[PDB]
Amino acid sequence: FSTSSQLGLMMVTIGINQPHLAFLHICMHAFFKAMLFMCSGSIIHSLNDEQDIRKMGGLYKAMPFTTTALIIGSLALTGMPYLTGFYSKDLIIEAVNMSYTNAWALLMTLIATSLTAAYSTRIIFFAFLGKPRFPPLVLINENNPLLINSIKRLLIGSIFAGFIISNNIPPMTVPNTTMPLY
Amino acid sequence: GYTPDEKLRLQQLRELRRRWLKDQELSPREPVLPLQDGAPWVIYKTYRHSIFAVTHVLIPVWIIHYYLKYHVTAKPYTVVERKPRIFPGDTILETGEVIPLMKEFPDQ
Amino acid sequence: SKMELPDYKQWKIEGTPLETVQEKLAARGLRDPWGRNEAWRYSGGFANNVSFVGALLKGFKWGFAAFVVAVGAEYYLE
Amino acid sequence: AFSAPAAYLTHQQKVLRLYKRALRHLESWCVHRDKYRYFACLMRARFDEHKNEKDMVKATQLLRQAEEEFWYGQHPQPYIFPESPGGTSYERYECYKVPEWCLDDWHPSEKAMYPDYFAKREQWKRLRRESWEREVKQLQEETPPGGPRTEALPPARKEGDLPPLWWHIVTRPRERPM
Amino acid sequence: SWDKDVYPEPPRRTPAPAPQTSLPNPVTYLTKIFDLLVDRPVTLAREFIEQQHAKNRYYYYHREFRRVPDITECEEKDILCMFEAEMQWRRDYKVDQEIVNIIQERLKACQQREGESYRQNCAKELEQFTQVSKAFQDRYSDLGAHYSARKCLAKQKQRMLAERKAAK
Amino acid sequence: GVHIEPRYRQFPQLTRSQLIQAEFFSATMWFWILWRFWHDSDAVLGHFPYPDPSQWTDEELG
Amino acid sequence: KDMFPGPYPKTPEERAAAAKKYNMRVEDYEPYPDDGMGYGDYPKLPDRSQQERDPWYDWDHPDLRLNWGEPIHWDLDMYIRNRVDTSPTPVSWNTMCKHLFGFVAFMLFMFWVGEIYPSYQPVGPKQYPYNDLYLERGGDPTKEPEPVVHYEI
Amino acid sequence: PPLTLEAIKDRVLYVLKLYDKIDPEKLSVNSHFMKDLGLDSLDQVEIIMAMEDEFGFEIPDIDAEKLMCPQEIVDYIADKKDVYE
Amino acid sequence: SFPKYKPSRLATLPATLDPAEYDISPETRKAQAERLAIRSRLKREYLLQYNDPNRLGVIEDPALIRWTYARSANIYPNFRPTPKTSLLGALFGIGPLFFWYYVFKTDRDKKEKLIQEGKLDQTFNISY
Amino acid sequence: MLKIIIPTTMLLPMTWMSKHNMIWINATVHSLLISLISLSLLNQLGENSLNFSLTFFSDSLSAPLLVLTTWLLPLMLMASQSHLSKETTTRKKLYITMLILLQLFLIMTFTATELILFYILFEATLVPTLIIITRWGNQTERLNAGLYFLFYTLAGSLPLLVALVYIQNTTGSLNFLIIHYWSHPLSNSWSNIFMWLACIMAFMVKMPLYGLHLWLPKAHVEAPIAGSMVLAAVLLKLGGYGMMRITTILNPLTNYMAYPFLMLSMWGMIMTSSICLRQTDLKSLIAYSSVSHMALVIVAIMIQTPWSFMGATALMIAHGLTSSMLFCLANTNYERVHSRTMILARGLQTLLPLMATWWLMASLTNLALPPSINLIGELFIITASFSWSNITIILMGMNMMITALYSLYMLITTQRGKYTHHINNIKASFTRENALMALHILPLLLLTLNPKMILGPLY
Amino acid sequence: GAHLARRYLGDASKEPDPLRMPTFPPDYGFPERKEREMVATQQEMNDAQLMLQQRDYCAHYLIQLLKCKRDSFPNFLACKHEQHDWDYCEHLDYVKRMKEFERERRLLQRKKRREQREA
């Protein structure tokens, strides 16, 4: 559902007549959303094919690397400054505000960003935080070179790719230089 | 709770099922019918890596460049490249040059 | 390498929220008989977990130290 | 492994099923264990309150009202065990399950690769082929004149007799065949 | 070997390299590596194959069809003259299709080559294709699946009668 | 081959490499955030101004 | 053969024979209404999806949740687990329809309202050089454009 | 996760011993909850739920009601999980 | 008094919320036993053939044969031209054809009118 | 054309005088060689047809169909080997002779230069097909299906014979070249309207048109595998070939008279694709899909535009191959389980893996996954109809969606799910069946690389 | 968003209409206004393949930025000053557009004041 919402945001960017920003958002979403789904796969494998968050808890320390990857991915998805999301989603929102737009569309997009923060908090709180609710036999083992390296590459991409791509790509839209602080 | 017949039947089925499962276990021998490649120590370190590099990238790159030789010359407009951007700078073919007014007020 | 289950006696409701739940139930005259089975979740290394802010601020101490060192490098060098 | 069903569910069995459904849906609503334990003890007290009602009409009305409450209070997305019906992993390995009769069609070269296993399989085939007649006779004898009035099947009465209609249950594909 | 007049290309203006930074340019070294590893072997292979081709050079010729009397000069039910004229008309139909194809290829190459200035700097090619498309549509469009020289003649006659009526 | 033995009701055995790598990457994320914020601040690039003076644009006043 | 479906039963004996043929109780057996639609003798079984049937029971055909010799619903292919599902829902069907359609209608109405009052910034139209890029935007070069002049504020 | 028969028995006895109403000392593989112990029907339901939560597999209600014994639970789990040793 | 569940055709009434599941009579229990008897007999026959070590092939289910026959062959023999059948047949067979004729004919006539009046754009429509 | 015809005729004496062991082998070998000879006809001069003789000519329309028929004969023999094994030598030879006579008649129909000879050969195909269906069918309904097929086709054809004789009397010749070159326009009179109806209706019957398609499901369901293969691949395409040929005579009235058949085909494609969704018999589902695709072809022919004709030719060839392959795939399951009920056999992917891949490829072609020739034909037809009316896209797109749905529903039901427990007769697929499926699939995929071969004369 | 508040909740006539802007002629008020000067030549913009949206009065800074970016590569952090120059020019243009909006607002209020003067 987060992926679907992000696709809707990209379609909004197209509607605002800002296509290249939409492509940039596609590029960054690829990284962080892929990393998030891989982390969910790691949790599922550790907990014997369990995908319900209610039966997952207290995994912050049990799986340090997956927890770090998910924290970084959620921060990027929610637009934490100077991560991959900041270069795409922050510009998308600023352009949406600073343009002729359907009022309800803009209001809905802002509420959608808030709900994105909401569901990232949902996953983190219910799964990694709290006390373990998974079945007794504990098989948590994230110490696989394939898993760690695969998540590592996407973590580095999520952290640094947005800066590199944004700087290198030629400027393709006139920036919204001045705007109200709020 | 179980009827006595149900208990007896289930226990007999348990014995038979466990016997079947143990029978399904493989023996120490799994005869595989028995060297088309005579490379017993193939340098696992690098021979495989260089062979893969050549076969997968080097051969296709050669073939595709040769196909570029074939297709570009054979047919006009097969490959069309966006005209390179020209700023106030020199051009290779004609060695032309220009400057952008520069009357712009410098301070900002 | 056969797995050994821990001693069942070690699990206790004391020192866990299950004890507070039991206190409420006793207040209403009810007793919960499954508290010990659920105790392991609230015991041991699982007992302590970070807050959401704490989870977000993971490595912030070392990251801030690295930021201080790099800023010192940049400012000092020039 | 499923036991044969009965024509009707007794009032006790219906109450037990309601209890299990209510507890599971409460656990779905009460994600954290402590809250679940507290409200589960509450539910057990609720059942105990009318555990001993003498009037069967009153108990039936209570069960009906409790079911209505359950339908209103059911979790929209109740937790389903991963391998249970409706679960994420339900029937995931069905395709990997392969019937035993397929091995008979293996080419002789393929059967050669696993000789001891196929010798044991021949032994099991002999056992089934011998047992079929006695199983049919026993089923005929025990069956009532009108016909079988329940799905339950009798156990082996005498030594040397396998339980009637045992082959498919015993030789059912493994849960995780791979 | 394609004719430049038939397939026009604007003269290439490529800016000269003007580095302003000390850092080595990765593209230059990667391109040199490509030249050495790929381009030189490919060039040698093509040299060998071209030598082999030169060893036995043979020629193929482009057939020339002499013009034959058109349908307008063919009497009614004169199946020989009608057949010759209809075959000529079909050949001309194919040739006009190829002409339209050439102009469209010019159009697409201009769209790609000009870049972000395609709207203004491709106007001449678009005008050429507009003229060619109007001519082709008038001549051959709407004839139908069973297109024939007679039907195209009838369409031309209808157009000419409409033009006379416009003259009034 | 049992690198991490399944523990029945106790915290799973954690190899040191897991913790070290996760800590390093999280600290790298925080360092990058702080470093970029210090070097470049996206807050504003010139306060949104308001042209109050009427003579600046038009002051006919009749 | 008598086992094959036959005409609509009219006499009670025909109804009993049909029930025996379809392996149903006589009371349970109800033919489709005799309206000339071709159903004839076939039983009119309850319109329940195969999903509704108990998963835990050991059905003769597990995937279809069906038993050998059981009367097969006329629309079984429609009611297979892959295809339509009629299982009871947590909320009433009418409430779900009302909520979903109301949400869609309200969303579209609010979009129309937004179109009526479209958000924008307190800025003037963007100004472009050379008569609004008339030549760059494909205008006729020979025909002189109507001059567009932008002055400094 | 071989899940041997002895492991299943040990875990079932673990869950039952952690059950307050059952007194640990008299708990045995053959201790019928209804007769040998004092558990009632709702206690049978609760214990079955505890077992299914411990092993992560759901016991169908028709089968669940008929266990009435720990060894029955162990063997049923073995049958469901195909444990032959 | 929580809001009641309105059953519908695509939302069947839960058995738990079935008003008849709590008013049972002796006859109903007898009927349930008879239904179990039928099922048990059918399952016995099936399992006997299914576990037969000699059987090789499908166990022809008469029910499946009856379903296929009723859904294909028995329809016309048990069809009678009736007011409902005749009217529904007319509507659903010929109705859509005339609707699509109206639509396509009107569109085509408009297009032809525009072409005749020279008021249609086919500047680059050179591939029909 | 005698290079192909004479060897096909010699096939009969070889089959009759061959040893009992060697009938199938000789027939297959020499039929394959004949097919190899037919590939020469694909070389077609763009401007003019290959006028071999007064009697016979070939164009870019007839060539692909001739190649298809010559190819189909060996596949038909391979498929029919299995169920005719018990039959006596004389009956097997008679079956092969019927197939060979059918091939000879179809080739002469496609290459014939005179409409009356085309009519004689096109109607002549009924006799071998009728004999095949009613003598080697396995159901009691084979006779009724044969009666329906024969009488539908004859009731369509005979007014065509009357119209053709009338044309011979008026114009003076029925040779296609002369008719095309002269081809005076028709006038909008009741007599000319009925002449148009007489010319069109026989091919409209041959190409299953909604309301005249009832014979196709019965015949395809009740016929033997070879008969179903010919009916789907070639016999239906005779209607399209004739309609494309015959349309020259009826130039102006076609615009006025097309609307009833155009509407019938356009709505019937949706109706039959929906029918496929709820069919309980695999063969019947395949037949209804054939009906829908032939409705698309009919729309293409009626529109009478070059792109529509190219799409019609491509679709005819692609559908012939795909439908024949689907019928053979269903026949394998029928032989194994001896029933055509879709539900009866399930989860066959686990039991027969490679046949599952054959099914997947056949279904993908059926749903027109690009760059399949099926998609090329359908897309060209769709574009031509869009030019005819932009509103046509709705029905055509809906038909595409329904086709994808029913094709993948067949694939899911037959090849997916848990295996039917009681069925124990499933045995490893023979090399013959896989070879038949591969011979079906590979030419279809290969034809995409060079699609001008199946794009027809207007290309 | 407050200008929208005045435009919609308050009197519409007083507030400028974005599409209609600028209704009042340039000559009104503003006794002398200089033509906006475009440093970049049209041929220069076409040669640089600038996007039509980017072909604005600040195009010269954009051309300089593109050239600096091309020359500096591999280094992609060497054009910060030119980027700031282009951004500042865009900021000035945006401020000018805001001033146009304010001018329209005040002019409309003055027109309403004249209508008030009549009564």
UniProtKB/Swiss-Prot annotation, chain A:
Signal peptide: none annotated. It comes from the Eukaryota. The chain crosses the membrane at residues 1-18, 21-41, 63-83, 104-126, 154-174. It is found in: Mitochondrion inner membrane. Belongs to the complex I subunit 5 family. Core subunit of the mitochondrial membrane respiratory chain NADH dehydrogenase (Complex I) which catalyzes electron transfer from NADH through the respiratory chain, using ubiquinone as an electron acceptor. Essential for the catalytic activity and assembly of complex I. Core subunit of respiratory chain NADH dehydrogenase (Complex I) which is composed of 45 different subunits. This is NADH-ubiquinone oxidoreductase chain 5. It comes from Sus scrofa.
Swiss-Prot record, chain J:
Its main location: mitochondrion. GO terms for molecular function: NADH dehydrogenase (ubiquinone) activity; ubiquinone binding. GO terms for cellular component: mitochondrial inner membrane; respiratory chain complex I. InterPro entries: NADH4_N (IPR000260), NADH_Q_OxRdtase_chainM/4 (IPR010227), NADH_UbQ_OxRdtase (IPR003918), ND/Mrp_TM (IPR001750). Keywords: Electron transport, Membrane, Mitochondrion, Mitochondrion inner membrane, NAD, Respiratory chain, Translocase, Transmembrane, Transmembrane helix, Transport, Ubiquinone. Its EC number is 7.1.1.2. It comes from Sus scrofa (Pig). It is found in: Mitochondrion inner membrane. It is a multi-pass membrane protein. This is NADH-ubiquinone oxidoreductase chain 4.
